[PDB]
Structure formats: C-alpha cells, structure tokens
Design a protein around this ligand. Structure first.
Ligand SMILES: [Cl-]
Ligand SMILES: [Cl-]
Ligand SMILES: [Zn+2]
Ligand SMILES: [Zn+2]
Lengths: 21, 30, 30, 21, 30, 21, 30, 21, 30, 21, 30, 21
C-alpha cells in the first residue's frame, strides 16, 4: 500500500492522490 | 514533479498537501 | 493529555501521532 | 467536524482517536 | 491536486515536496 | 509574490513548481 | 493509543502535543 | 532517557507525558 | 540570523534546532 | 514569556538559545 | 549553538529559520 | 553542497546561512 509505494519505495505526487477520498 | 521517499509524518504531510480538502486515508496496514 | 488547537497539517500530524500503525482518515468539511 | 473543531475551538487527543482506522 | 493555503515554513515544506531533487528558491518579499 | 500569495490567498502546486531549480 | 519511534524534531512535536501548556523538558543527554 | 525510551526504543503517548513539566 | 515569528509547535521546532544536543525546556504561560 | 513573545511579536534565535539546557 | 544532521524537509525548515526573509536556495544537486 | 555539509555530514546554524540569498 501507500507505505510500500511511497516510503519503502518512491512515489509521485500524482500517486499520492491515489489516497485522497 | 518528482518522486521522493515519503515516510511516516512526512507521508501524511504530503497527503495533506496533495489531497487537502478532498481529505485522505492514511492506512499503513494497507 | 491536554487539549489541542490544531489547524492545517498540524491536525494530520496529531492524527499521525495518535493513530500510528492503524493510521486514520482525514476528512475536512468541503 | 474534527478538522474545523480542532482549528476553530479545541480538540482532545481522545476525539482525534475516533479518526484512527 | 487542490489549491493550497501555505504560510511560513509550510510553504518551504510544500516547495520541498514539489521540487524534490531539483530543490527550489524560497524568495519572500522583504 | 509566491510567498505572500500562498499565505494571503491561495496557491497551486503548479505555481510552486515555478520555484523549483 | 500506540507506540511509534519518535526521534529528533518529531519527538519534540509529540512532546508538544502531549504536554502542551504544561510544557516539557527535552533533555537528550538524559 | 527520552531518546532511548522514545526514539531508540518505542514509546507511548502516556510515556511522553513523563517529560511534561 | 533573522528574527522569528514562531507559534505553536514551530517554536519547539526552532528550539530543537537551536539547542540540538543540550535540548531545552519549553515553558509557556498557563 | 518566550513562547508568547515569539508568537505575539518576534523572537531572536539568540533569545531561544536561553532555553537550551 | 550546535551542529546536527539536517536532512530533507528538516534541512529546508532550518534554512527557513536561519534565512527567513533573506530567503534561500535549496539546491540538493549542489 | 548543502546536503553533504548538513545532512550527510553535520553543520552549524551559521553554515546554513551560507545558503541564504
Ligand atoms: Cl499554522
Ligand atoms: Cl526523518
Ligand atoms: Zn504551522
Ligand atoms: Zn522527519
């Protein structure tokens, strides 16, 4: 999930939107 | 833009920035 | 614990602290 | 809600704890 | 992305996020 | 400028992106 | 609540949250 | 002390109160 | 260094920076 | 005190340095 | 004062504190 | 540069001024 996508791995600002409501 | 490592309180900062008024779920269990 | 006055990303911060591993949902009005 | 209430008045850690998953 | 209301170090924060590896210049008026 | 504008009104991530090196 | 790792500036954020108006000592030498 | 309890090791919110005045 | 306008946890932040290893005491009025 | 003074007016890093242990 | 490790968003916080109204360049490429 | 001086290595507040405009 987000921690793997964004912390463990790297992620874009657009990916972080994946987690918007 | 870019891809950086976003961990912990910095992750949720970033979510706050991106999502704002849409709000977000921070669900570290996944 | 004392009561908080938390605006913007400082809310998400406090939420991060409080919720830790469970995470949380940040859900503003509009 | 929680968001406005912490920012317009005040806000207990215990109320915030309702917003954990 | 949503629009932002960013004051003080929260601007530099958002700038850090947005710019990442390129970095940025923080340049206020006076 | 960007600084005052984000803080006095509002501010797009896209405007901030003008301030990347 | 939870237990997380709280280091450096994040530690003192958390102390700020918990203690608030009681205030706190951050004494890393111990 | 706090850095060992809270950073090196893990600690609770209630433990962090230990360091309130 | 320039003069600061520091409210809430941004004070504790600045204090953290300034004091580093010595740490500090955060002591508000009431 | 320091707390109110940084937040109601302004605040030098040098004043804050009085609050190091 | 002190020397600490200042990385990422914390680095730019610190630059914000030190520089303030002079502003700064964060140029991680160097 | 700054990341080497300040993150990889350690740096003072006075050094961080090096990066003021
Ligand atoms: Cl604020
Ligand atoms: Cl970190
Ligand atoms: Zn703030
Ligand atoms: Zn951090």
């Amino acid at each position: 999930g987000i921690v793997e996508q964004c912390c463990t791995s790297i992620c874009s600002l657009y990916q972080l939107e994946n987690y918007c409501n | 833009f870019v891809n950086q490592h976003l961990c912990g309180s910095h992750l949720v900062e970033a979510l706050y920035l991106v999502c704002g008024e849409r709000g977000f779920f921070y669900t570290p269990k996944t």
